[PDB]
């Protein structure tokens, strides 16, 4: 079936717990595969040791810039960027996993987990999964955000990988 992957997250050197994500490879196989391999680190790079750099309460938690660590960077397993696979999955509510981008067809490695229904991103951001377990951790991360997106704690993906 669809891969299950995990992110173990620290805030200020203290463990918050684990976020488990289902990657909808059945709908967006290319997008799912990229995120899966970046969790395992099997291509020589990935999410391990990178941060949630932009968090906005009542909106979303963003991460995945493992090259520049500031929201300008990241890269995919295919190359620096890859196309929007489709917009079939919708931003239906809290727990939705979606690709951050800098406009059409600029997917790399940055992603976000929604804390509300972000329906206005439908057709603009590629949704590729959702939170199976660990919304409690996501709400903690959300609480360390701000209006500007600047985080009030240093939030780090200490470990990540594939469960199935
Ligand atoms: N099937 C699901 C279970 C729990 C949360 C979800 C969030 C978005 C899409 N699907 C979801
Ligand atoms: N892939 C990306 C996602 C979100 C923001 C970005 C900003 C600059 C370059 N790439 C970006």
Residue numbers in the entry: 44 to 207
Paper text:
Cyclophilins are peptidyl-prolyl cis/trans isomerases (PPIase) that catalyse the interconversion of the two energetically preferred conformers (cis and trans) of the planar peptide bond preceding an internal proline residue. CypD is localized in the matrix of the mitochondria and acts as a key regulator of the opening of the mitochondrial permeability transition pore (mPTP), which plays a major role in calcium efflux from mitochondria to the cytosol and can lead to mitochondrial swelling and cell death. Cyclophilins adopt an eight-stranded anti-parallel P-barrel structure. Their PPIase catalytic groove is formed by a mixture of hydrophobic, aromatic and polar residues, including Arg55, Phe60, Met61, Gln63, Asn102, Phe113, Trp121, Leu122 and His126. The existence of a deep pocket contiguous to the canonical catalytic site, called the ‘gatekeeper' pocket, has been revealed.
